[PDB]
Amino acid sequence: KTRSSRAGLQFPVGRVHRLLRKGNYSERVGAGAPVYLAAVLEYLTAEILELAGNAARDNKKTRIIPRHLQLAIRNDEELNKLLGRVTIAQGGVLPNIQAVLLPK
Template identity: 70%
Template sequence: MSGKGGKSGAKGGKAGSSEAKTQSRSAKAGLQFPVGRIHRMLKKGNYAQRVGAGAPVYLAAVLEYLAAEILELAGNAARVSAYCARCHLQLAIKNDEELNKLLGHVIISQGGVVPYIPPELLPNKTTKPATRKEFQASLRTSNRAFVFHLLVVYFYCVYRIV
């Protein structure tokens, strides 16, 4: 007895265990967006010399959240229709303040135009500018605003924009 191995069966491998299924990084993170593909694109795009293991997971989660948010709002805009068209995506983005700030400059092909309502016909809003402490408190209470804040900080760090 050499002491090495410790295998009881005639075949190689771990004793008493069947073959384990390989699990994708998307499945491990509980995401639908492809983490491996995003990792490959980050490496191929020369955004940085090296790409960490957590960066594509985080980016996939942010992209999945944004896609779900846009599709939810577009689905609400397309309540009567049987399907969600491009014009519903355009309406969803333009009518939401935060999404419009993020994607306001994006042109959606065949998206149509957003109906314009003159400001005189809209109800008056009397709001004062928030202080830094009030803004941070509102971020803590609003989950959606917090995610957008993280998104802006992430893109600022990665792409040096904003």
């Protein structure tokens, strides 16, 4: 049985372990580090896909596209902060018109 299934995870613990061992991060890598990291990565992925899935069906699409990811991310203050210097290709921007520019 895989380490990922032992950890309750979908993300690959073994691959993460190898990527840490060979990324020139440290001389040694502890048994719990890739489990912990894979879990963090999985958690953030689920957070974004949950929100993007919601936008996708609020636009009546069965497939998540970059727009939906952009909408999900910029409408969430914490995701938007975590990804504040990231450009999502083909994501566009949030609909936002400054109130002073509206008529009347």
